[PDB]
Paper text:
We first designed Generation 1 containing seven P1 mutants (Y55F; Y55V; E174A; E174H; [name]; Y189F and Y189L), and these variants were cloned, expressed in E.coli, purified and used for activity assays. By mutating the P1 residues, the activity of the variants was vastly reduced with E174A and E174H incapable of tolerating histidine as a substrate. Further investigation into the changes imposed by these mutants was performed by solving the crystal structures of a select few mutants containing changes to the active site or the pocket residues. The mutant structures were able to be solved using WT as a model and retained an equivalent fold to ParcuCDPS (Supplementary Notes 4 and 7 relating to Supplementary Figs. 13 and 14). Therefore, the disruption of activity is caused exclusively by the change in these few residues which appear important for the enzyme to produce a CDP. This was because Generation 1 and 2 variants essentially incorporate hydrophobic and non-polar amino acids potentially altering the overall environment and electrostatics of P1.
ParaCDPS from Parabacteroides sp. 20_3 (GenBank: EFK64745.1) produces cyclo(His-Phe)8 whilst ParcuCDPS from [name] (GenBank: ETB63777.1) can synthesise both cyclo(His-Glu) and cyclo(His-Pro)9. ParcuCDPS belongs to the XYP sub-group of the CDPS family, characterised by the presence of 3 residues: X40 where X is a non-conserved residue, Y202, and P203 (numbering respective to AlbC).
Author numbering: 1 to 4, 11 to 60, 70 to 230
Write the structure that this text describes.
């Protein structure tokens, strides 16, 4: 695959690999490709995490992590240790939800939850957002479910917008195989062009960089 940028082939950034569990593209082979591309283009490290899902925990991301991410990561570790040299393997960091969701990240999430409960324009935008995603799924969903799906998005939204640390490692950039409704929405947020209060409250002027990489 290849980037769809001079800072990259100058290896300026660390690169996160955001895996959407359940999205048919993220087979184990496509995941291996994305990791190989990131090891070749990263400044030093590649961070691998589970990034959405388009009760054993109070957080949906945490629940996904312990129910699925553990076994996914185990399959990824096996494949990697058979595809990559041992020194290349040194560059990789498997970041669970807890690695990312430090206390500083949680305040940003709290700000979004708060805003989801108090700003009905925001509430309705986020929910219509879920409503559109799922109106191409054959299955249907009620409004309480639609509303619960919305909070799940808000839980991942800071990661998409700001540069954060996982196990003490800043990663400025992340790879994803195509543009999505979400990536356009995040773009607008970072520019302050939609719900600008969000930019003012949770973006510290170092925006997460989205790199589109596909075959």
């Amino acid at each position: 695959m290849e980037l769809h940028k001079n800072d990259i082939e100058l290896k300026k950034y660390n690169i996160g690999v955001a895996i959407s569990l359940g999205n048919k593209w993220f087979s184990i082979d496509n995941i291996e490709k994305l990791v190989k591309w990131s090891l070749l283009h990263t400044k030093e490290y590649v961070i691998i995490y589970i990034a959405d899902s388009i009760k054993l925990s109070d957080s949906h991301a945490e629940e996904v992590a312990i129910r699925y991410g553990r076994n996914l990561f185990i399959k990824i570790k096996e494949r990697v240790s058979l595809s990559f040299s041992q020194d290349e393997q040194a560059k990789i960091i498997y970041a669970t939800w807890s690695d990312i969701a430090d206390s500083k990240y949680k305040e940003k999430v709290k700000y979004l939850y708060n805003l989801y409960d108090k700003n009905i324009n925001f509430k309705n935008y986020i929910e219509n957002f879920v409503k559109e995603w799922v109106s191409k799924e054959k299955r249907t969903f009620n409004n309480n479910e639609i509303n619960k799906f919305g909070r799940y998005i808000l839980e991942e939204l800071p990661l998409l917008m700001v540069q954060v640390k996982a196990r003490g490692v800043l990663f400025e950039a992340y790879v994803y195989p195509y543009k999505t409704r979400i990536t356009e929405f995040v773009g607008l947020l970072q520019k302050g062009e939609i719900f600008p209060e969000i930019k003012t409250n949770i973006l510290d002027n170092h925006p997460k960089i989205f790199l589109e990489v596909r075959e």
